[PDB]
Amino acid sequence: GLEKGFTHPTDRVVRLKNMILHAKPYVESERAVLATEAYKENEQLPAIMRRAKVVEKIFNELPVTIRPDELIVGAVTINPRSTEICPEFSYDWVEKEFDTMAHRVADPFIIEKKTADELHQAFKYWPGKTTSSLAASYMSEGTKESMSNGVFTVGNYFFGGIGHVSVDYGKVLKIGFRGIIDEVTRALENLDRSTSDYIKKEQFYNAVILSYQAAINFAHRYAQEASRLAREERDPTRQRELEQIASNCTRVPEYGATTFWEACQTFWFIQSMLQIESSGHSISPGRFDQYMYPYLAADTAISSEFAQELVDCCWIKLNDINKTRDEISAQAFAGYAVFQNLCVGGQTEDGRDATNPLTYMCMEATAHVRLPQPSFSIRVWQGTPDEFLYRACELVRLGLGVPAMYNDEVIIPALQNRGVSLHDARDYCIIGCVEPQAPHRTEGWHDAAFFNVAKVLEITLNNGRSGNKQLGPMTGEMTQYAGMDDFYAAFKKQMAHFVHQLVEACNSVDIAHGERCPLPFLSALVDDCIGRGKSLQEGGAIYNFTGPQAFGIADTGDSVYAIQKQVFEDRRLTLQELKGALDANFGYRSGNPRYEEIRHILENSPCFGNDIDDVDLVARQCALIYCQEVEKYTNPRGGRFQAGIYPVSANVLFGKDVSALPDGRLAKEPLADGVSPRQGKDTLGPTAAANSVAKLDHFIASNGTLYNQKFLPSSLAGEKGLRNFGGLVRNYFDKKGMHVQFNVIDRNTLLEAQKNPQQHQDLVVRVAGYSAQFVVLAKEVQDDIISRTEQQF
Amino acid sequence: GLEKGFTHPTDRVVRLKNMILHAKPYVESERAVLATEAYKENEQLPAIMRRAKVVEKIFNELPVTIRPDELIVGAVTINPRSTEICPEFSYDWVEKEFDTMAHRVADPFIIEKKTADELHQAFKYWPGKTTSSLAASYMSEGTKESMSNGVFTVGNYFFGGIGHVSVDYGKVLKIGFRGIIDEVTRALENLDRSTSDYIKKEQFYNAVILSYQAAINFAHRYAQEASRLAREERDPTRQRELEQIASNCTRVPEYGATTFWEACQTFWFIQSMLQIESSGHSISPGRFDQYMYPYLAADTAISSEFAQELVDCCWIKLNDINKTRDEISAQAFAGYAVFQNLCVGGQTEDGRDATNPLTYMCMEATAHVRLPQPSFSIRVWQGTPDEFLYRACELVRLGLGVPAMYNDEVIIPALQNRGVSLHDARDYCIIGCVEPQAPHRTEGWHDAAFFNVAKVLEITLNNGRSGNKQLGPMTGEMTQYAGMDDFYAAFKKQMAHFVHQLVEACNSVDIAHGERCPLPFLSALVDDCIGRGKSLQEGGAIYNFTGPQAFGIADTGDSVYAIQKQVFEDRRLTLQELKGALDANFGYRSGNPRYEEIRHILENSPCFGNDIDDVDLVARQCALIYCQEVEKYTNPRGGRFQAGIYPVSANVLFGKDVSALPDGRLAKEPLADGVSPRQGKDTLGPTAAANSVAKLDHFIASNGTLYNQKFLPSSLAGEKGLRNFGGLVRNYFDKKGMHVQFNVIDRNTLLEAQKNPQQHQDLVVRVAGYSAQFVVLAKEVQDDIISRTEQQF
């Protein structure tokens, strides 16, 4: 039968899982202090060589920690699930939050007094030497004013590192760090030295070699710690394990992997070491079933049980990573989340189906571990085997939010439209939440900014004003609109003004990272940085993009359609009354009964998400106006801006920046998540809603769209629930939606977790493009997830 | 007749002159301290804006000093003829020399204890933050090793600023600093903001505007000081002068000049303020008679005596500038020397003669003032009026070394061969010593390096060795040469190896200046920096070059010819004995009589400078081998390397780096100056010697060649003396030599200045492309000048 069920993990895997779940996150100082001293010691070097010295000091001197029971080793932090500090990007919020970070609503971290004193001393070096301080200096005053008023924000790469990449894991698996060094050495040998261009390329090459020499030492330090622990082990079974780990770390990643266990250790060293070099999140394993499976197939000795246990251990290690952000930024990325997206299935470079036995082991590992990370995903195409889709649906029924599902038949042509070859696009993986790329060939900047389209709508209707600040052009007061043509013309002018500022802000951050923090370790693992002699930050990648995200799409669409229908077509109210009602927040505080009646009229207009073409096409048009502006622009790496539509955990946060809207929502209330219909407003069932969402132009939003659905668990029960559920996915993907993902949970389970969080520490659910512990989320985010529409078949 | 003699200066001018002569040069700290605080305060800015903040703080806060009697005001230093410190380029040698600089051989400066304490504190900021520290980091180990062994040096721009430019004085005279600000404002309004490129251009533009706003303030601060002094001044005439100076400085250079006195004040504000922004020397007024004359002709009130006295005051102000360098570099640029070349005459853009009345006033000013500066020059072409050449010749007869003479008919086609338009080339001026450019269109880097061709010959004959060290390729041992073909093959291979390293070193310094010290004040006065939105350091100039200088040309030619004639042709000695004699320094210590007999044989070979084709063509070929290798290379500004041949005061210094040579020269002895025949070896008179020098390829050495002659004064006496002397210049220029200049002095006058320097403080003579106080020069440089061939007709 279609319902196969899931096996159980070993007792050791349960212990390792529980270590993550019980861990109290700390802030730690050692990496920050070492980095700072490497900067201090190397003021005279070009930035790329200084950055080599940084990772060399950290890799040589960071504490090496092997946790009880691990088979796969490597720790960013001494304490499980803790965070380093990367002061080179930003630091002052850390010190501002020394005493409040342990108690803040979103993602609290403990900062012990000694750690605070150590960070205080190191931060003395940093004023004005960060990437953020340089980025802000490049931006115009109007751009900064627009961000201060909540039109958009580039905080992600402003305050932290970039990340958002899937590196060439397979290359390191094959030839190791030593192979990387040899490739660079041959690039040096072949350098054209007839002009002045070789001088900086040679600095890059020597920086990469130094970085990778230190990276080899780092693995050897873990081998040494494993041997030290082995000598004082008393259980001979664990002793032999530690001896085997020492052997593994001696071989990899210096050399290519020769067993499946070594291949797992190669993967984890890369995955953790990249996040030691930089705090950029969305370091995404990508197509792990593809590049790892050859090492499983070739390992004739390994048992199926132990092979699965190693994948489980990788899943758990993926949850050891954590990241603190400033108190407001943490609310937009909430849940101790670093967005490591790992996908399985899809197509080979040849257009054949890519499923292999490891594909299903990856699904089993998710069922075994049941933790937020990795951000597990499946690719789907016309040739997806029934067995893979139904097994994925079985996994989704567990209610963890994973796997998210991505549609090859939209994503591949979407990438092609941006210049990615068919061969490279067929190999895509997901970065972060929903953002597709050709892996190890792209510097995509896939979460460069958040952009509030609903705020632009607000500002349009107030003639460029926000507060009493003239923030955009005076496109005309809404009372002077003769019809919807006047609105759209005004809305497009506002969009052009604010998107140009968005692009300025992203590109200023882009220049700042290129000038102050080019990365020699990361860059060697992406084509064509070695061949070109250029870092990722300076255009070494074959493909270059920048991806800013739209917020408030359904809010904007339903509001614009409410103006069309209720004011112009049916004349239920005038432009003057609408203006008055919006400014008065529909009488929320005054009690004005005409404004209340107006609100009730607008609230009951047709809404996006009910398969009604009239209103669905307005949502499509409003999203297009954003997406068509964004793609007009380029970044300093020679690449193209491309829109995405996804909220991570900030559709509540950024709703606070928007006053009352013509669809009737009150000031400061939440916005809609991604391309999903407004919370509770898709009332005709999951098929009708998905039909609406697929009417949007997903292809032009080539940084990725995000669609959330939430199902009543009993609707998915039994073989016949699975079949209906799989039919819904194929329906939506056949109609050219890009992505869909599912919560499967009873309302009372969420309500109980709120009332009794101590009893629900392992409740993991989808936020948007990632899953998190529900009890870690702030109440306002929890309420937003509860408020989402419950679907039923 | 042809000798009309010279008028005398006013008593004021004599007082202003003697103030320079009697000044004891100090090191001062104010500018270094202010610059350091501006860097400390502005760590977060892009470099161009940081440099704007640097000049803003200095221009706002540097002490304002007006000296007794001046009509033209503006002081770089509080004390006359003193030096500021520019730690942004290098600092550590200043502190190493706190206790020794007042007593050192070449260019001593007094450093009082208060000043050393101030600089000690300021220097704490600088480790690793200088342009020099970055430049070194880009250079390969072999390049730095060749420099340590004396093959070549890039010290000039490594330790100090660049300079070496003639800015658009005419533009500032016409539109003022306000007009510069207006052009940049229009460039801002016209910026294409559709890509990412505008972000950095707009930073440059904002940096230029800020710098020029502060530049206006600087002039107003001098106006306020003149007004303050006027209220204090008992003498009614001097009171009115100070009131007029206050009016001048209020008008210029914020606005264009409206009198000749204001034009002189504009000139001097530009000249001094450029050398406040940067320590780069060879800030060259260039075609002063061309851009200043319209303001003289339009000034219908000024008397000729006052106009002359203002020009005299300009000449004296040019001697107020001074510059300290580390104690070894000071020996290469000896004489309190900043190389401000000012030329008169030549052609206009349409190819007409450019002589005007101010042309002759500039010659008079040199006769009035008789100080080392400016480095006064004349252009000469086929159409030079006889009155011009003969007047310049009378001036040379005064023995100051000036004017140097430059041949349009070589320089203009030479510049054309480097891509300069005929129009631009016709407007050329001289930079520094002998280096031509199209003024306000060029970033020429005209003294980027000193390169020791004689050392390359030494190394060639020792199979790539220098001392106990393999510095170049193993091109073969001397004893294995079958003939001169073998030697030239090896020599060219050595030359290619070391010139590649030279180019690396230059380009490393070039990159470092572009990344850390782009200049927003200077850059605005050179085409096309404003139009392109790019500093000079990043390629804003229309024409870009790099100019490295050959040393030991005559030494190399005569040695190579001595091998050809004495070894291969006449078989007076074997290659084996020559190797032994060179290694043993011709028996200078051993007394070996065969090596002494070989020395005598080689010393009496024919020598370059006696109009003997056989040996002259070897000098030509050897100089060509250098010049042809240099021109194969480019710089990171998109420009071309081009050789020059000139020694400034370093042919003695760099001869110390060369062991015995095949021409009989003993180890460590001086090398020949520029393209001049070896000291004392041209024995057939000045026409024969000039004929030899003109056989070299001067056109390919388009960074400039330098030829010194020295005459017995009685030989130039009378109308007949002048006629011979003009005919010699016209002979040499018709035969396509690029430059010539003359000492005219009795040997006993130099000898008496050595024995009784306190009676010869005003004795000014030519070193090489510049003039200096003979008593300020080290004994070994004095002796070298005394050893030069004395000519007579």
PDB file of C-alpha atoms in Angstrom, chain A residues 396 399 401 673 676-677 679-680 682 685-686 689 707-713 715-716 725 728 740-748 750-751 765-767 774 781-793:
ATOM      1  CA  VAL A 396       4.577  16.045   5.081  1.00  0.00           C
ATOM      2  CA  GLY A 399       3.316  18.034  10.462  1.00  0.00           C
ATOM      3  CA  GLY A 401       6.413  21.537   7.513  1.00  0.00           C
ATOM      4  CA  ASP A 673       2.871  35.679   3.674  1.00  0.00           C
ATOM      5  CA  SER A 676      -0.530  33.193  -0.175  1.00  0.00           C
ATOM      6  CA  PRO A 677      -4.055  34.621   0.069  1.00  0.00           C
ATOM      7  CA  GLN A 679      -5.143  35.024   6.296  1.00  0.00           C
ATOM      8  CA  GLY A 680      -8.599  33.440   6.399  1.00  0.00           C
ATOM      9  CA  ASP A 682      -9.488  32.026   0.830  1.00  0.00           C
ATOM     10  CA  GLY A 685     -10.947  25.243  -0.344  1.00  0.00           C
ATOM     11  CA  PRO A 686      -7.355  24.366  -1.261  1.00  0.00           C
ATOM     12  CA  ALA A 689      -6.910  28.858  -3.561  1.00  0.00           C
ATOM     13  CA  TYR A 707       2.977  29.667  -1.051  1.00  0.00           C
ATOM     14  CA  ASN A 708       1.856  28.384   2.382  1.00  0.00           C
ATOM     15  CA  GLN A 709      -1.040  26.016   2.987  1.00  0.00           C
ATOM     16  CA  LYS A 710      -2.252  24.567   6.298  1.00  0.00           C
ATOM     17  CA  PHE A 711      -4.336  21.382   6.405  1.00  0.00           C
ATOM     18  CA  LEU A 712      -6.539  19.721   8.968  1.00  0.00           C
ATOM     19  CA  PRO A 713      -4.613  16.483   9.702  1.00  0.00           C
ATOM     20  CA  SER A 715      -8.149  15.390   5.794  1.00  0.00           C
ATOM     21  CA  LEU A 716      -4.830  13.758   4.810  1.00  0.00           C
ATOM     22  CA  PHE A 725      -3.093  15.395  -1.347  1.00  0.00           C
ATOM     23  CA  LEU A 728      -3.439  18.892  -5.154  1.00  0.00           C
ATOM     24  CA  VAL A 740       4.071  25.023  -2.157  1.00  0.00           C
ATOM     25  CA  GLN A 741       4.522  23.797   1.396  1.00  0.00           C
ATOM     26  CA  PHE A 742       2.216  22.558   4.113  1.00  0.00           C
ATOM     27  CA  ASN A 743       1.508  22.773   7.794  1.00  0.00           C
ATOM     28  CA  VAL A 744      -0.538  19.748   8.889  1.00  0.00           C
ATOM     29  CA  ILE A 745      -1.757  20.488  12.401  1.00  0.00           C
ATOM     30  CA  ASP A 746      -4.858  20.900  14.559  1.00  0.00           C
ATOM     31  CA  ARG A 747      -5.689  24.375  15.833  1.00  0.00           C
ATOM     32  CA  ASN A 748      -5.805  23.069  19.414  1.00  0.00           C
ATOM     33  CA  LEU A 750      -1.012  25.252  18.452  1.00  0.00           C
ATOM     34  CA  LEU A 751      -3.231  26.724  21.184  1.00  0.00           C
ATOM     35  CA  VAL A 765       6.000  23.736  12.304  1.00  0.00           C
ATOM     36  CA  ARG A 766       6.449  25.769   9.146  1.00  0.00           C
ATOM     37  CA  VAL A 767       6.798  29.533   9.366  1.00  0.00           C
ATOM     38  CA  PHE A 774       6.531  26.964  17.689  1.00  0.00           C
ATOM     39  CA  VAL A 781       4.046  35.302  14.997  1.00  0.00           C
ATOM     40  CA  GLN A 782       2.343  32.311  16.653  1.00  0.00           C
ATOM     41  CA  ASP A 783      -1.038  34.042  16.348  1.00  0.00           C
ATOM     42  CA  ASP A 784      -0.332  34.798  12.695  1.00  0.00           C
ATOM     43  CA  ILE A 785       0.325  31.094  12.001  1.00  0.00           C
ATOM     44  CA  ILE A 786      -2.823  30.125  13.919  1.00  0.00           C
ATOM     45  CA  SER A 787      -4.795  32.700  11.920  1.00  0.00           C
ATOM     46  CA  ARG A 788      -3.785  31.126   8.597  1.00  0.00           C
ATOM     47  CA  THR A 789      -6.592  29.464   6.651  1.00  0.00           C
ATOM     48  CA  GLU A 790      -7.256  25.816   7.530  1.00  0.00           C
ATOM     49  CA  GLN A 791      -7.747  23.718   4.393  1.00  0.00           C
ATOM     50  CA  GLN A 792      -9.758  20.499   4.136  1.00  0.00           C
ATOM     51  CA  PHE A 793     -10.602  17.884   1.562  1.00  0.00           C
TER      52      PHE A 793
END
